[PDB]
Each structure stands twice: as C-alpha cells, then as structure tokens.
Design a protein around this nucleic acid. Structure first.
Lengths: 111, 52
DNA sequence: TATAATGGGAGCACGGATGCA
C-alpha cells in the first residue's frame, strides 16, 4: 500500500537517523561503517540473503555477521541504542523502497 | 481533585479548613505530520523533558 | 541531485500424447 505524508516522513527519518546511528557505531567500535551497515542489513534481511560485497575488505559470511553482531551487542546500553536505531533504520529503508515501486513504473512507461 | 491532608480550626460557629490539594491540569498540543512523539502513553515527564 | 508526480498496452488440419472431468 502507498504511504501517507506522516508515514513517508517517518520512514525517511528512521533511515537518516539509522545512517547517523551507523556513523555513531563506527566512531564507537572503531570498525568500518560499510561493514557495520552490511551486518545490520544482513540481520534485517535475515537468513534468506548473505553475499560478499566488493567494497568490503573482508568476505561476508554468517560467521562474520555473527561475530560483528555479537561485537555490537556487547556495547553498553547507551551505545547499544544505536544498534536498534540502525536496525529499524534498515527496516524503514526496505519499506520505503517497497512503497515507491509504482512511481518507477509510471516513469518507465514513457520510455 | 483529591484532598490529601485536612487541617481544621474551630472558630465561633464555624470551622476553617486548610486543605492540601492534589489535582491535574490538562493541556493539549497539536502535532503536525512532520513531527514525531518521543514519549509513550502514560509516561511521567519533568520540566525540560522533550515531548514532541 | 529537490513543486509534485505512485499498476502497461497490444492484438487450417490432423495427428499423438497427456491431462482432466
């Protein structure tokens, strides 16, 4: 179903604050923002999809995603907040992309 | 409103009651579509705490 | 990279084999 103004702004907000949260976890943990983002995304998408990203310096496998996930969950509550923020951020991103798919069709029909 | 403590002073044919009263005064806040509520239902806030 | 825009458009004839009622 198509979003509303409040829903759109909500998802957008969660996405932006999610990316900010990823940057925060990068500042805290000292890891690569791309790696953290890909791990969070991996946990959001679930066991359905795991694949190596060309940009990452390390290969992406469930062992690694578990290591990094448990490495993120070992943080204190205030630092563990950004994890939840990032997760809900990725979820919001998925819902946001899935919501706008009609626009793409309406644009592509002219091409 | 509920009366917590009641002090009574006897004067002539009358009594003067000093009432310690506790009540709640409601105030509405209209929320626009571009704003989000950061507080849960029935939560206790304080002075300076952000609601919306 | 910034008004908002959110579901398409075209277009005969007989056989064996299997699928279904």
């Amino acid at each position: 179903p198509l979003l509303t103004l409040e829903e759109e702004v909500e998802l957008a907000r969660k996405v932006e604050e999610g990316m900010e949260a990823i940057k925060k976890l990068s500042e805290i943990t000292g890891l690569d923002p791309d790696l953290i983002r890909e791990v969070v995304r991996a946990k959001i998408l679930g066991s359905a999809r795991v694949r190596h990203i060309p940009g990452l310096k390390e290969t992406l496998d469930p062992k690694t995603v578990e290591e990094i996930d448990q490495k993120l969950k070992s943080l204190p509550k205030e630092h563990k907040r950004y994890l939840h923020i990032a997760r809900e951020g990725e979820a919001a991103r998925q819902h946001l992309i899935e919501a706008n798919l009609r626009l793409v069709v309406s644009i592509a029909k002219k091409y | 409103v509920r009366a917590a403590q009641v002090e009574a002073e006897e004067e002539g044919e009358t009594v003067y009651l000093t009432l310690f009263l506790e009540w709640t005064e409601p105030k509405d806040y209209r929320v626009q579509p571009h704003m989000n509520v950061v507080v849960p239902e029935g939560a206790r806030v304080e002075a300076g705490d952000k609601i919306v």
